[PDB]
Design a protein around this ligand. Sequence first.
Ligand code: CL
Ligand code: CL
Length: 162
Amino acid sequence: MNIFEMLRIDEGLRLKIYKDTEGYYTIGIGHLLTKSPSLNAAKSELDKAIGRNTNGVITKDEAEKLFNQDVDAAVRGILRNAKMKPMYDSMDAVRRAAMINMVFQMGETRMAGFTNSMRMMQQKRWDEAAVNMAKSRWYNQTPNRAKRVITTMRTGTWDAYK
Ligand SMILES: [Cl-]
Ligand SMILES: [Cl-]
């Protein structure tokens, strides 16, 4: 179990553009194309991502490329962050893996509503951190997967991915 195997599970593999539970155009392993009602915008976004005229479908090899970047993107923002660096650096390899998962999924911006939890976290208040976390727009649209990341954060283990 690693970060890639981990999001892949939670993210899914789709070679055709789609909309998430939020209604946003998306492709591959959870790669957000555009929060924009326009499919065309999404397509053009897709093409830019890939650098070729897609008409909404890609190869999984293509999927995996975005996946790399995205993953890279994530870790980088954590590490590129005043508030996050200290947090990540503070954690074990697993809870770190979970941290990437969250950022990848939501993004920095949203990540910050998560400050008290990440704080409790720093206090080792897992359980509490954990119940906190569930109380969220995030955990609410996607419980199954959010339940998994939290359990992860909480236990310092991979059981939920077992
Ligand atoms: Cl591990
Ligand atoms: Cl909801």
